Design a protein around this ligand. Structure first.
Ligand code: ATM
Ligand code: ATM
Lengths: 204, 204
């Protein structure tokens, strides 16, 4: 059938980018690697500013919508590649979008408001949340990181309770690159082997 | 009390801009003129490139979000000016954002989805819709405007059912600058007198 959309979510420095590259290289040549935010586009450009320069002041709602817009500008290419039989591994997506913004506790910006902009976007066939027991960019402070992990758990737990079986939480506490690799593969392989119709897609 | 938020909506070439400038000169010195989209900012610049150059390709969902983000990056200063007693004349706001986008008929982008990103925004104290019974920018085509007109009507008609009385539909057909001005004023003057508490606002 069509390729699979695999997502790996988690806190900055949990081994996310590494396991993504590892999974990507192991799925060649019919696999593409996608990173969010996608900083090479014009919208991704303002997102890069915001994250690397605090003089660039932008309200919480504005930057939030830019992050969702950034996914919407690329989504059509994703759907296309999947149809051409290629697999796609993503480093962050909708879940990071909601969590990092909701952890701020800004008036009006709760979990539900935060998701809305992303409603209609392609939903991953499988989402892996890597969890455990710098400072260059805006959200890089131990105190904030603790809050987003709290929100992440709140969000995912809600979705799983609601019946979403495509979400799997992997505890990578004190485990090596290859042990974590084996854990992830133990989960992804069986989904790569299931046949999915070209016409079947899930959306947020 | 606080200054009042006055909004004038409508189709391109309905006299909307000239009326806003007339009202502004009439409320000055204690008044500010604000136009959306505000193409002065970085996000506004992206909006501008999309509207002035059809070479610039961007998904409907992505541009829609940039339009909302453009409002969200200015709203704090709007609120601030009202608290200091200054009145604000606004040329286009969230109604244009929902109408011009839902008119496209793109799958998933209905009146509902289109409104979500603007939820939580300061609702204007008075909304005047200029109704009637160029070509160097995107959207500026006779066939599209017809769709936008019918979209505005369905939207505004909806808000009326819900109980919003701040929306007034002013028919400007075959009328001159001065006559329309008189109509606008007969609706604006009352509101400008009505006492509004320093901290009372309506939101979307
Ligand atoms: C994709 C995405 C990431 N982010 C943040 C997470 C990251 N914050 N930190 N630390 C930041 C940069 O991400 P990367 O380090 O993964 O490039 O963007 C959001 O706020 N929303 C989103 O939609
Ligand atoms: C403020 C705003 C304007 N628009 C469109 C309306 C106008 N369309 N045409 N033709 C366009 C530019 O309007 P102005 O000429 O008033 O600058 O922006 C939206 O699509 N959504 C919005 O949120």
């Amino acid at each position: 059938g069509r390729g699979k959309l695999i997502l790996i979510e988690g806190l900055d420095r949990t081994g996310k980018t590494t396991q993504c590259n590892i999974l990507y290289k192991k799925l060649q040549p019919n696999c593409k690697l996608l990173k969010f935010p996608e900083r090479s586009t014009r919208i991704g450009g303002l997102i890069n500013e915001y994250l690397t320069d605090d003089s660039f002041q932008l309200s919480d709602q504005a930057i939030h919508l830019l992050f969702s817009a950034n996914r919407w500008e690329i989504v059509d290419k994703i759907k296309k590649d999947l149809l051409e039989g290629k697999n796609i591994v993503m480093d962050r997506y909708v879940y990071s979008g909601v969590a990092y913004s909701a952890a701020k506790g800004t008036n009006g910006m709760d979990l539900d408001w935060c998701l809305q902009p992303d409603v209609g976007l392609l939903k991953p066939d499988l989402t892996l949340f890597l969890s455990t027991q710098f400072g260059d960019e805006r959200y890089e402070t131990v105190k904030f990181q603790e809050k987003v992990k709290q929100t992440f758990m709140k969000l995912l737990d809600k979705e799983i309770r609601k019946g979403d079986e495509s979400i799997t939480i992997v505890d990578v506490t004190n485990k090596g690159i290859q042990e974590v690799e084996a854990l992830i593969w133990q989960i992804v392989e069986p989904v790569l082997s299931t046949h999915i119709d070209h016409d079947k897609f899930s959306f947020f």
